[PDB]
Amino acid sequence: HMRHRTLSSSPALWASIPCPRSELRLDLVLASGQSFRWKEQSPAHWSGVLADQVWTLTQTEDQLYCTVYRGDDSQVSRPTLEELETLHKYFQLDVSLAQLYSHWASVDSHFQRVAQKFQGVRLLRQDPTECLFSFICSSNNNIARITGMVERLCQAFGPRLIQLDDVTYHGFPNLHALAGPEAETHLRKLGLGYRARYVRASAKAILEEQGGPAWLQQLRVAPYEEAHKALCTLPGVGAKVADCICLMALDKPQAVPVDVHVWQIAHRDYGWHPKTSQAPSPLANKELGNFFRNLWGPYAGWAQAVLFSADLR
Numbered sequence: 435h436m437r438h439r440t441l442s443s444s445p446a447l448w449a450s451i452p453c454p455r456s457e458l459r460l461d462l463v464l465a466s467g468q469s470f471r472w473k474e475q476s477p478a479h480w481s482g483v484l485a486d487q488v489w490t491l492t493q494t495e496d497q498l499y500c501t502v503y504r505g506d507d508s509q510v511s512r513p514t515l516e517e518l519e520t521l522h523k524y525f526q527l528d529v530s531l532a533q534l535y536s537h538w539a540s541v542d543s544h545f546q547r548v549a550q551k552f553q554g555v556r557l558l559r560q561d562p563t564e565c566l567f568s569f570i571c572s573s574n575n576n577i578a579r580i581t582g583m584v585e586r587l588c589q590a591f592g593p594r595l596i597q598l599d600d601v602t603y604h605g606f607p608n609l610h611a612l613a614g615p616e617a618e619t620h621l622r623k624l625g626l627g628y629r630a631r632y633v634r635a636s637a638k639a640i641l642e643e644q645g646g647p648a649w650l651q652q653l654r655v656a657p658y659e660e661a662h663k664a665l666c667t668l669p670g671v672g673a674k675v676a677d678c679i680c681l682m683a684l685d686k687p688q689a690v691p692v693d694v695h696v697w698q699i700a701h702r703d704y705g706w707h708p709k710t711s712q713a714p715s716p717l718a719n720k721e722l723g724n725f726f727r728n729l730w731g732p733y734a735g736w737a738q739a740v741l742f743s744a745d746l747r
């Protein structure tokens with residue numbers, strides 16, 4: 435009945451935000467392994483679900499064009515002031531990426547070279563719950579396989595929002611839905627494997643041990659290291675997944691998620707070797723995070739995303 439919108443098809447239902455290409459590149463950000471909920475359903479048109487609503491996003495050289503599908507058989511219209519504020523916070527456009535790029539480049543010759551082609555790579559401000567369970571699914575996994583597990587998980591547990599063409603869109607499920615006695619068995623049938631246990635276990639833990647989603651909001655205003663330790667008490671959440679959530683959901687820009695991916699970049703592109711440590715290891719991984727924080731500064735996590743986006747593309 436209802437189809438995916440393009441800026442040419444139905445320009446009446448679109449709204450713009452003043453945003454240069456230097457500050458944001460949809461094609462780089464929405465497929466850099468930050469969110470796993472956006473798909474380029476038509477060329478230069480990125481469709482995904484955001485806070486129990488579906489969006490389609492496209493851009494020019496100095497404008498970010500966006501349209502909303504409410505889904506509750508409502509009168510179709512342009513995005514509101516509040517819904518545009520939601521998108522502004524989501525891309526964290528209040529922060530100048532140009533000034534950060536220059537600041538990182540001043541102390542890093544390697545970043546300077548990569549910063550040429552790969553501009554407008556910024557960090558999304560994600561829902562802690564969506565981010566947490568998405569990055570529990572990320573362990574020893576590729577972007578395409580993670581995107582599969584998260585899509586299936588949302589269709590099975592999350593509430594249906596709308597159908598556009600052949601794609602049925604579901605919002606991310608609440609903690610109670612993932613904590614049920616059937617949850618792990620269902621999730622294994624959806625192909626999560628060993629990750630199915632950590633999803634149910636972490637959902638049950640946040641509810642019983644930590645007192646629901648308000649905890650993840652407490653970690654948002656808590657300092658980085660208090661938040662990191664707190665997340666590491668959850669089933670299937672270590673330093674890597676804890677740093678990812680910290681960087682991408684809990685506003686900890688100095689959070690540098692360290693696994694084999696940054697290790698490769700650290701060694702090949704920076705000639706880094708563990709100085710204080712003997713032998714990858716928990717101690718060596720922490721040293722590597724401190725190395726990048728010492729080099730790039732309090733937005734070290736944002737810098738890593740630019741090199742990550744560069745290594746993926």
Ligand SMILES: COc1cc(NC(=O)N2CCC(n3c(=O)[nH]c4c(Br)cccc43)CC2)ccc1C
Pocket residue numbers: 466467468572575576577678681691695735736738739740742743745746
């Ligand atoms: C862009 O900003 C960030 C993204 C992440 N995401 C992440 O670490 N993962 C785990 C592996 C996935 N992945 C993969 O499958 N191959 C990859 C190659 Br090659 C490079 C980087 C990631 C790759 C994507 C989800 C972590 C931190 C930052 C700042």
Ligand code: NI
Pocket residue numbers: 701707
């Ligand atoms: Ni070497």
